[PDB]
Design a protein around this nucleic acid. Sequence first.
RNA 1: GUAACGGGGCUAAACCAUGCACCGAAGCUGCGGCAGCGACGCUUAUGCGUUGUUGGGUAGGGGAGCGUUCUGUAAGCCUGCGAAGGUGUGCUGUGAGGCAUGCUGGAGGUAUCAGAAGUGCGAAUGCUGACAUAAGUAACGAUAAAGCGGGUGAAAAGCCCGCUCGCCGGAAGACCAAGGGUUCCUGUCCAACGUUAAUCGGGGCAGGGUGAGUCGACCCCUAAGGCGAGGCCGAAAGGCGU
RNA 2: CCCGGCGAGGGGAGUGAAAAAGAACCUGAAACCGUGUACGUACAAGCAGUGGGAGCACGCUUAGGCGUGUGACUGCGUACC
RNA 3: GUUAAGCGACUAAGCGUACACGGUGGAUGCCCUGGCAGUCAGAGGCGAUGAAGGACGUGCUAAUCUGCGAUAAGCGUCGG
Lengths: 50, 56, 26, 117, 110
Amino acid sequence: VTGSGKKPWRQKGTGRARSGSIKSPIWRSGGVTFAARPQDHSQKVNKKMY
Amino acid sequence: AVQQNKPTRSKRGMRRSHDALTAVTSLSVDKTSGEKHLRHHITADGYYRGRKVIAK
Amino acid sequence: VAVTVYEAWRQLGYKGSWWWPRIRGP
Amino acid sequence: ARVKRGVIARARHKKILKQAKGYYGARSRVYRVAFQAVIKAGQYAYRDRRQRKRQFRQLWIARINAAARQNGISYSKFINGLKKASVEIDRKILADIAVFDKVAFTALVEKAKAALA
Amino acid sequence: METIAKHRHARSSAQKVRLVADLIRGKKVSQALDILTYTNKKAAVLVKKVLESAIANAEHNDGADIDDLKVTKIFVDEGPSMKRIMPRAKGRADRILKRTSHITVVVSDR
RNA sequence: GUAACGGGGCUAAACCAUGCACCGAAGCUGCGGCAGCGACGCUUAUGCGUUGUUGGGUAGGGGAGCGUUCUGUAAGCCUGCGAAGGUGUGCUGUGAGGCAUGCUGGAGGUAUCAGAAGUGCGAAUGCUGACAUAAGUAACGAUAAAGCGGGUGAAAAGCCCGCUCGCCGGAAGACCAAGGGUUCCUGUCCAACGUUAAUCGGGGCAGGGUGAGUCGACCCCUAAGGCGAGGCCGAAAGGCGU
RNA sequence: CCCGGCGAGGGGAGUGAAAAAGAACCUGAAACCGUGUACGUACAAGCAGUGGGAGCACGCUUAGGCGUGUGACUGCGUACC
RNA sequence: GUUAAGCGACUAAGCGUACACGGUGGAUGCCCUGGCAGUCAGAGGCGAUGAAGGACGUGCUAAUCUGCGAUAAGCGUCGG
């Protein structure tokens, strides 16, 4: 995902939940947890079965 | 100091029960001109108790 | 006539400190 | 491939909120509170389905006792005499009779007293 | 017959306007006008203008004879809010709301 | 704060012994319904009977299902005499659910049997938008200070004229440099901006305005310092220097 | 055409199948805020429900009685992860 | 008719529940000249005859896009 890997705010001190990246899959406009790739779906059948 | 729980709309309404306002309940009629006004105030064209005040 | 527009800004999260003595210090 | 949860979630929330009518305040307007209210109501209903029978039996006994003492005998001796006379009428019917018929109840008392004596 | 006049996007909070609306709910128009004339409030001017507009509508479009009109209905709703920024101390910022309202008046000879 | 019977109260409504009654649980029995596992029969296979018995449950193991979006069956079927979606009501199943219909809506939806999953949310000081509470509360930014008459205007404490009062005066006065970039002047407007109103404005819109032989840049001369033909160094990039 | 400051906003008329399609414009949910009607509530103590239960209002019904809303009084009962 | 004693509907400043009608807000449904992953072909460079990328101009025109370069939303010739 397009963006930079800079921590949005410091770990401790601010009263907000801990964050470490703007591309986290639970942020709006973040990535997909288990994104897909192009795939092959063909199977195999024995000659005799055919 | 700040609240620990959110007060309800019922409590909000009960607090405002004393916030209503009242009307003047009566107006007065000048003897000569015959128009309405507040008590002990001059009319809109400088009349008071029949006499003709400046009316600037 | 012009239309109305809004804007916003966030702070830097200034590192404030508790300047009084510690609650249950050493 | 991509599925949107828009309609099913609304159906579930409406279904839960429908059976929370008449509850006070936010318990009938907000889903998070209404869900707990409905669950607790279900548990209470399950328990009271058992408590009802006890409450009614206790009321019947208390009502029989008064009429029995009106005719001049206590509840315990009255039903002991009835058992000795082999009379199988239960407590609900006995209380109903004691209220709506003052003569049949007197006849029953006579029979119980005769058998017990 | 019912006649309606409205003022939308009035520059005032609904809670402040609601204090004046209940003063005239159910009165005759003749006494409602001079009740509104002698209250020292900002919203009284707005409500008075709306009421006069309603009376004129009820006279011109439909039948005449405003001598037997009454204020049958009146209510105030909430319009959209404008959002602004007000600076505070030590570099903080706060959000300001400027609320509006809708004013409706219904009159009827009956 | 009675405060060492749960209370009221009790001389038996206390304690010992004997006896007979009754109250008392989701325990047991009676009536109706559901499911699991055996045994014995019939079908002599799915299945249908006779019975016996079992059915609290976290971590965890095993078995059956509902619903959502896409592909085939699909140039099929439903639908402007009203589709999806929204909002009520009535039936129905053990449950996740299903069916019919009133109002709104204005053009799409899919039996059955198979196939594939970005397939189901209340919590993560979760992410984004909208809206509440405190509350019509705290505040309105130097304690140099204002009063009155006239004008204009829908409307004047704040605008414009006039007369008084007060404050600064090695500044809170008048010129520049750096920096800014039309904020300068005139006519029009008051939606938004001005911590209130506004007829006013450094606000909106339309016009106008900056004139050099001598003022300043440019130009001639060099400081600190920079670049540096050849040159000397260095795996490359480069370093230092006439 | 009318009210209004030669305003902002409305009410009529007209276009259109539809203006509750009027430019802040397809459909238009929830939190949140209002107006109207029925019932309850100013001697009463607690996770606000659940079991019992008068009275009142409305509708149907041939009495019989049902259906919907509210709910005096009373037994039990210390949210979720 | 007068005295006693007993019992006792009617109030709502406001609040609750249900229904009817609204406001705010922009979810859901239905769309798409916008993106994503590939198959089959092509081309694999531009530049001292001044590049890639820009500044400023150019119209009946205030501006901003798209073209163009003092011959400036265009000039000549050959074809459709």
